C-alpha cells in the first residue's frame, strides 16, 4: 500500500519511532518519502544480488532473507517478504535494530542525501498527531 504522509506519520508514531534513539518522527517520515515514496512494496535490485524491500528499503544482503542473495546474513531474522506487508511492524522492528548501530540513520543513503541536516519537522507539518 501507499501511505499518505500524515497517515505514515501517525503510523510510525504509534510504532514508536518518534524520538527513537534521538531521531525525530520527521526524520523517519522524510526517509520513507525519499526511500520508497511511502510504498510498502517498493523493491529495488542492486548491482550485486541484494534487493531493498519495503517502505524503508531494507537490504537483503544484511538485514533480511530473500533466498537469492549471496552472503546474506539476515540480521533481522525475518523473510524479506515480511518487509513488504501493509502492516509496517516488521519494517519498524528491523529499522530500530539498524539505527541502533553507531552510524544511526546514515545507514539509509536516501536519508543522508535528502533529509539529514534539513528541517525534517516540516514532514509532519499539518498533521494532527
Amino acid at each position: 500500500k501507499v501511505f499518505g504522509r500524515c497517515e505514515l506519520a501517525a503510523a510510525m508514531k504509534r510504532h514508536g519511532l518518534d524520538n527513537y534513539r534521538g531521531y525525530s518522527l520527521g526524520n523517519w517520515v522524510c526517509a520513507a518519502k525519499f526511500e520508497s515514496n511511502f510504498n510498502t512494496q517498493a523493491t529495488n535490485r542492486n548491482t550485486d544480488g541484494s534487493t531493498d524491500y519495503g517502505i524503508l528499503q531494507i537490504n537483503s544482503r544484511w538485514w533480511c532473507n530473500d533466498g537469492r542473495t549471496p552472503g546474506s546474513r539476515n540480521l533481522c531474522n525475518i523473510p524479506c517478504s515480511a518487509l513488504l506487508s501493509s502492516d509496517i511492524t516488521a519494517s519498524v522492528n528491523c529499522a530500530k535494530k539498524i539505527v541502533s548501530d553507531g552510524n544511526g540513520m546514515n545507514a539509509w543513503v536516501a536519508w543522508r542525501n535528502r533529509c539529514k541536516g534539513t528541517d525534517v519537522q516540516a514532514w509532519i507539518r499539518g498533521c494532527r498527531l
Epitope: 518518534d18 524520538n19 527513537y20 534513539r21 531474522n77 530500530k96 541502533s100 548501530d101 553507531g102 552510524n103
Partner: antibody, heavy 113, light 108 residues
C-alpha cells in the same frame, strides 16, 4: 536457535580488572548485536552495554568508561572487561543477544580482597 | 537517564486470579518497553517486546498494553510457575534502563 554461556574467574580483587567470556553457538558473532547485563545482589538489573555490526559499541555511562566490549577474531566468542572494580561490582553477569531473546545462564563474580 | 518505576514492589496473588503489573517511565518512550520474567538461579526471560508484541513460546495468558509513560503487563489466570520477579526495560534512549522490579508471590 542460538545458545550463549559466560565464563571467567568467580573472584576478582579490588582495583584488578574483571574479565568474562561469552561463547556463542547457533549464530555467527560478527553477524549480530551482542550484550552484557549484570544483576546486583539486591536483584536490581543494569544494562552494561552492547556492540553492533559496524563494530561500534555503546557503554553505560554508569560504568564511567571502565568497560570494554570486544569480539574475538575467529572463535565466535565476545568479551567483557571491566577495570578498577570494587565490591560494588559484585554481581551475576549475563551476556545476551541484543534481541533480548537468548541469554546465557549467567555467572557470579565477587570483588573482594 | 530514563527512570522506570514499578509499583507495587510486591504483589500477592492466588492461583486462578489475574493480576496487572505497572511500569511508568520518567520520560515518554512510546512503545519501546519490554517485559521480562526472572526466576531464582535463572536469566531473565523475555515475555513481551515493544509494549504489546507477543513472544513465541510465551503462554498467551501474558499480555502487555500501554504507551508513552504508562505500561501494563497482564497475567490472566495466574498459575503456580508464574511466580517470581518481573522487570520492564526501555530501549528508546541510551542507556537502556530497567525498572526496579515487581515480585509476584503466592497468597496464603
Amino acid at each position: 536457535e542460538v545458545q550463549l554461556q559466560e565464563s571467567g574467574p568467580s573472584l576478582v580483587k579490588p582495583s584488578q580488572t574483571l574479565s568474562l567470556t561469552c561463547s556463542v553457538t547457533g549464530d555467527s558473532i560478527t553477524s549480530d548485536y551482542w550484550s552484557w547485563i549484570r544483576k546486583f545482589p539486591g536483584n536490581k538489573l543494569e544494562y552494561m552495554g552492547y556492540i553492533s555490526y559496524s563494530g561500534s559499541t555503546y557503554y553505560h555511562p554508569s560504568l564511567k568508561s571502565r568497560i570494554s566490549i570486544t569480539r574475538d577474531t575467529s572463535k565466535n566468542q565476545y568479551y567483557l572487561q571491566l577495570n578498577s572494580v570494587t565490591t560494588e561490582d559484585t554481581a551475576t553477569y549475563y551476556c545476551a543477544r541484543w534481541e533480548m531473546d537468548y541469554w546465557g545462564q549467567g555467572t557470579s563474580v565477587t570483588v573482594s580482597s | 537517564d530514563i527512570v522506570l518505576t514499578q509499583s507495587p514492589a510486591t504483589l500477592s496473588v492466588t492461583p486462578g486470579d489475574s493480576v496487572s503489573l505497572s511500569c511508568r517511565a520518567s520520560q515518554s518512550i512510546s512503545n519501546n518497553l519490554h517485559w521480562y520474567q526472572q526466576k531464582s538461579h535463572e536469566s531473565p526471560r523475555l515475555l513481551i517486546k515493544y509494549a504489546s508484541q507477543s513472544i513465541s513460546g510465551i503462554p498467551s495468558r501474558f499480555s502487555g498494553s500501554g504507551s508513552g509513560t504508562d505500561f501494563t503487563l497482564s497475567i490472566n489466570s495466574v498459575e503456580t510457575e508464574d511466580f517470581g520477579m518481573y522487570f520492564c526495560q526501555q530501549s528508546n534512549s541510551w542507556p537502556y534502563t530497567f525498572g526496579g522490579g515487581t515480585k509476584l508471590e503466592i497468597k496464603r
